[PDB]
């Protein structure tokens, strides 16, 4: 389904990441479909011009949530991929805990709080290598 | 050897607000605007292992389904004749014609001079009206209530304002989450919870006093508040099962089709036929007896399993406070409800009002002119919930008392939408891995 | 051996039009402008960067002018119409200690209009000033009775300006001149960039330019065209020269049902004495201010010119007048005792009118409700907005009038530092590097 | 540093192309959060039917002008590259200097009066150089 | 061993319902509401070995011309000012000055108290109506619309001059043109090119007898949706115009009377000279020449020895029985029983009187009206007729005989009859097929 | 050729043209506001007519939106950045009982869709899962 088993653990959420990856876009898509169910009363909705305000901004911002999420993977390097290994290693003051509870016993839901704190840090640190990464990569075909 | 890995499409979630989209299913105003029908088969996900935190005072689906009502309530009059020229002095006498005791002096016989489809011409005409929308100058001459403050629109006479249950569907990128708890306190941790793609199909039912055509708190009668200890704040008081209401307005009416301008029409009441009799609400007693009890066996248990519990009549103010204000076939009755609540714990018939300008969702400057319903009457509705306000009790720590309370129409919504939560989802997250580039 | 490298990310912009958002700190401009601004504005400054500015061109002038205007009808555009008002007044003089000045200038006229019933009418009465009083052939009609409807600014809205800051939208930046005594056209050496202006107030006058930036180091004068007497110039002064406003009228109110919950606001008695309106300009202040323009205008036509200023020519008062809006109420200055001496305490009084046709169009008219009480205004004169005189030969004395008229000039005057570009990210140049 | 060292030598200025990549939605995003900031004030521009739509406008069209320089990039093979080369060689008459003669202390902003009107002639050599490349890899892989 | 390829960028359409945009060639509201220029030169791309399926008589783009015109319509009238002061009872005589013996009785006279700029004052004034405008009580006279709608008055500065428009398509979407020649409305189209915009329609609105539109090339063409059902319409497409000169000879005078503050009324005035009354001109022959082709193309479908006959039109109102013409602003109503009034048979100048009327129910909606102001001077019009529409009289079931008539009034048929060549489809780009190719 | 040109050639002849229709069902979009800019003053009086303007502002959305589906939906299948690609799925022959030879040569794209319509969803499902799988492995094989 749409959230899937998000009380599973963290290894087993990993099963099904593309079903939630493309649920933005496609849920986007089906909402026009679903407005062509009934093409005729198109007229009687567009006369209420707040209401066709409010859909085109909720449209517009779930466009530009979602490119802005790209793009940032795309700053990375983890365009294309769901799975994104970096050059980034991890810091035990984010989670002083093992690949153990962390994969098996822990849910999503739960890492989520627990390391809240470093969202923005780790952002920048894989910003930062990236960035590198590109310049070496050009000299070295140079 | 620890690296971090960057997921995309991780199931995680977070509190957030965003307009819902009303949906429908296979001249009725909210079908007329929920035209795209929900999902035929909206199957849930049962989000084994996941405890979610709710609030359902706090919730904000109840000011979205607020204020779309009014919204499409207001965009169903404004295309709509204004009654502005029917402001005028009118010259009232009793109906004496076949009167029983209970409305005399209720109902009046007025005349007035109102104009023609030509702008040199006026009309002598005349209509009966309800006491409680005329209002006598300084003993023949009378106004309409409403002169001295608003103005007055006549509803569209095609436009049916009848209850559709309507779900209320998340924008992607969102989830409505609900909770399956049998006993669920209003607040915090509640398990069983799935998610869905659309709410339960909620009517858009207008009371005060008394909760129509609800959900029924599956097996308990439950007593759920925000800050309970705290007289001031509503008590909403689901029941287990429903109690039958039969609301009537027995007189056989008449209606007139009046030109008051190029195309425009005045819907005016015209005579009666019949006896004219009283408006009114049967309730069986028995049933009414044996739901309070319950009510109260739960009330006790946050006033004290000794304590006495009195149930008292309405305060005072307007009638959208005092009376059960109940909307049915178009027509606007304010029923005497202290017939129910007269008892201390330790069939019954409500009379009730006819009004046709009235001022919906708790406002002034505007008001709303229900064309006459021909014919009688009949209406047959489900008691599913009450709500209660709690007297301070100065230092009496004996007894306690209760009233009819209510009047706020976000209390009508929270009753069907206290299990639901909208999330926003966040595909974005890291975790430590054993791999590196 | 160099082969082509495609860049993305490239500083690099350039001119364009797009549309900018108002952002801000019952007030209209207040009310409309909900986007906060970033309380530090991150400015850049640029280093190596030449660009051309020209606020004769400046297309941030023009959505000044659009936003303003569609904010006014905005606001204005729930409120009571007056129509009700437009019958035939009966009007007599005023007679309750007045003054020698006004002495017809405010009437007391009555009139028959409906009440909330529409088969009664009611006799009220209330005070007009005569600008806006037209005689019939004691019958009189409102002044705009025979162009266009009136109606009536609610009572609750405020339009004191608050600095309005405007702001461009991701993907544009604002380009800033910091050049001191910049031309207001050509090239500027000294720039930085940001994302919203400083904050201007949306200030309405005619002749003066009144609470705008006061000009660094000197003087400044800006034209398009000095050459040319068809152009208005702009004055920006270094050293501001307050002035001191008032309408010292005891006023009161009364409140007319109209309609079902229609009011109109009436102008009620004067409580004691009539006095005149006006505003005081330090004398000696003006007097060097003046002069400083005077040698500032010297040296673009010569160190033997003789500057003599004048009054204005004939017009509206829009024109003849120095418009100045204070407490929301309507002042009409007339400002020729600024302009009497030739470069070899000022009382100017001030009427009143209610009836306001603000902008340049002619069909709607909007009433300012009165204001109770007495008020005081003081204001600080940062410019003046000048024209020329006509053609001639004799170059020994030229005159110079207040101008202005056309509010664009007011906005003008802030935006001209500032431009509008896009940014461009993609491009290509060489590289000693190949697949 | 949204535009730091325009005027800067390309070759220096690169350094921010990082920066000013991320900028556009970045900031589109949160001009939409300051807004909401104040729900009370922002419900009122619900009446402003015009400023509804400008700003509609203004907000579709900064990503489609995105949307179109990254489809672009992706034509010519240089998808999630800032500084990609190709297999097209610099044609000598666009600029008639050497390297360091093109990075002789001149910025961007410069360096576009001297790509001029070559713009359009280059984009499409760019995508009939991608268009071989990836034939040639579909029968390649076929092998 | 096959497997799975994946392409973007596929050249395939579906069949697609979406909005276009309006587009105008290098005060008329045909023009400022279509901003966007079109493109001077257009490219059509010929489309080799693609047989395509039209069908003009679902096809959607009608309908949303159909709806843009009625938008754009109500738009044009919302800023002008209302008429409802002038619903008064009018004391009229009949106009007796000069008159042609036709026009006896079809001009009044009527004066009427409105009130002026002051809501205390009321004037004395008087104009001039058109007999169908106006309706008696039980002298004493009333305006038609009085009972059933307020009328509005048109502006008297916007033009609704026919300006030709292009519909164009929006990112995503193609418009597929049928060039084939004698493709009459349905089927396969084997000549077929892609668009991005239609050519310039001219959004002329009339009954009858369509104005103005498209020639047909080689043979006149007989386009219906069933031809068999007595129900349908049939849309003629001629392929050599037929010239028609209309005029409204009196010459005309205005007065503008000021009923409000900024509003002003406009009311026809005197007529200077004599009063004749408005027609138009068919070349006799012409039309003869012009109507036995379309004789031999029914034949086709309806016999040899099966007798053709044009009779006149059926019963209803003015926007039925005769030919609508909006011309210089001016309405129209058009006798055509001069044009259909013959019987053929097998191997084997002309003058159309007009009414003219003030009051107009444009768009056969009621409850709202359009005052169309009158018009100085003396007006004429030169226009091509260029198809008919034309129903079959249904009750010849069994016959040596078959009758046509004029029909029509629902204006989406007029535009049908352009558009019947164009259709919307929208590009779906991937798709998958075998490869030899694998990872 | 033309934006739909050689509509009605083999599919193996109509890769030829694949980023033709690639690029135009995008930039059109900019050209058209293009083409609006015009006349900004003309722009002004259509931004008061309402309805007109959320249609339009509908229209632009929806092209992006079906854009950007696709787009999405070639990442997920890992072919993004790629006109022409190649799967671990192979061809079923059940979806259609024909050689290659007779595929890309004598039929068109046109054809092949109604060819092959009904097996839409399940090969779109079956590309999805050799993604899944991969880029597991990838992250196993790093590790
Ligand atoms: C809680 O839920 C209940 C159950 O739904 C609601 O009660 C129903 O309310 C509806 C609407 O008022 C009632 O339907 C109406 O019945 C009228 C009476 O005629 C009936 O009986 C005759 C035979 O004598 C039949 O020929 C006829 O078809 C009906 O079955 C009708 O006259 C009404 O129709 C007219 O008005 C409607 C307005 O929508 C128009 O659409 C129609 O075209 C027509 O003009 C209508 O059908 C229904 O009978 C009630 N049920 C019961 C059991 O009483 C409660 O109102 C709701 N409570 C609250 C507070 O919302
Ligand atoms: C089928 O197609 C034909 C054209 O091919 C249409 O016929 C034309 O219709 C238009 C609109 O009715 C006619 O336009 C009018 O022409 C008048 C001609 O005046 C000439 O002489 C005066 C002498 O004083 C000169 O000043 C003038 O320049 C001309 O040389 C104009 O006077 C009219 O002006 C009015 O409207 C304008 C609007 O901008 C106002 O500003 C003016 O003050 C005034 O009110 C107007 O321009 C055109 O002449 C017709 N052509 C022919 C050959 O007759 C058919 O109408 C069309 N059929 C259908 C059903 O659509
Ligand atoms: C319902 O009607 C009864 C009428 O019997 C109301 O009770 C009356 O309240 C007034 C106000 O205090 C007293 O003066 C009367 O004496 C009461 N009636 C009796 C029995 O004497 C009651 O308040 C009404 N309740 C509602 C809900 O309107
Ligand atoms: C939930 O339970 C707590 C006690 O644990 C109580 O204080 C609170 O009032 C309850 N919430 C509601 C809505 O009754
Ligand atoms: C509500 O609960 C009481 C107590 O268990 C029970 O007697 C009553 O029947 C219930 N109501 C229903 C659903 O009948
Ligand atoms: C309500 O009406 C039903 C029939 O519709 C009847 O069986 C029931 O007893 C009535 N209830 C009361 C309280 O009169
Ligand atoms: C009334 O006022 C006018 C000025 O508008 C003045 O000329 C006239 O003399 C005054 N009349 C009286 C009696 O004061
Ligand atoms: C400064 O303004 C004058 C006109 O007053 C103009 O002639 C001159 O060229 C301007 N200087 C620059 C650098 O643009
Ligand atoms: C303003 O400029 C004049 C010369 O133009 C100078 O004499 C005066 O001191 C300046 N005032 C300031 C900035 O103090
Ligand atoms: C002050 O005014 C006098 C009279 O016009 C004039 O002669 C003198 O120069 C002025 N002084 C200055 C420069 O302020
Ligand atoms: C013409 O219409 C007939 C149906 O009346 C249809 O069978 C035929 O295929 C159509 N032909 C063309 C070329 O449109
Ligand atoms: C017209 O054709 C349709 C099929 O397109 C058919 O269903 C219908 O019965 C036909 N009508 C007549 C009158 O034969
Ligand atoms: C169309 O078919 C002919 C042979 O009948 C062939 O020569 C031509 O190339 C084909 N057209 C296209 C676009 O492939
Ligand atoms: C091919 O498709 C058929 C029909 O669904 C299916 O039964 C068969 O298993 C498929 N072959 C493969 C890919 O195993």
Redesign the interface.
Known sequence: ????????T?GA??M??????R??????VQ?QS??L??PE??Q??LK?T?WGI??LQ?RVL?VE?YLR?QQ??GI?G?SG??????????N?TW?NRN?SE??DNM???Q??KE?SNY?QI?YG??EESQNQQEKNEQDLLA | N???????????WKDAE??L?C?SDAHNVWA??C???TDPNP?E?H????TEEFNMWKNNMVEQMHTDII?LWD?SLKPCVKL??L???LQCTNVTNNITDDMRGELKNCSF?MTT?????KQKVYSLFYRLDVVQINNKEY?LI???????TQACPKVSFEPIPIHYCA???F?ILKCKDKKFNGTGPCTNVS?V?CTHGIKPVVSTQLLLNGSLAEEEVIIRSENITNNAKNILVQLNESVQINCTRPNNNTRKSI?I???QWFYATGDIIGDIRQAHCNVSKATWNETLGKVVKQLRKHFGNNTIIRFANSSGGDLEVTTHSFNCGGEFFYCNTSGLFNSTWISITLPCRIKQIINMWQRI?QAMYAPPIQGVIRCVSNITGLILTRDGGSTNSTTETFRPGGGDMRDNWRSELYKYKVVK?????????????
């Open positions: 389904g749409f959230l899937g088993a998000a009380g599973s963290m959420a990993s099904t990441l593309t079903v939630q990856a649920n933005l876009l496609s849920g986007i909402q679903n407005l169910r009934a009363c198109q009687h909705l209420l707040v409010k859909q909720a779930a949530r999420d940032l993977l990375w983890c991929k769901l799975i994104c290994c970096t050059n980034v290693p991890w035990s989670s690949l962390i994969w849910t999503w839901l890492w989520d390391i969202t780790i640190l894989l | 620890l690296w971090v890995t960057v997921y995309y499409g991780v199931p995680v965003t307009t989209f949906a007329t605007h035209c795209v029908p199957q996900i989000l084994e292992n996941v919204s965009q502005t020229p402001c005028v002095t001079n489809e030509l702008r040199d011409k106004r409403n002169c001295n403050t608003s103005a007055i924008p992607a990128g989830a998610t793609q030109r301008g190029p195309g400057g989802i966040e595909p974005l997250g890291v975790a430590p891995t054993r791999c590196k580039r």
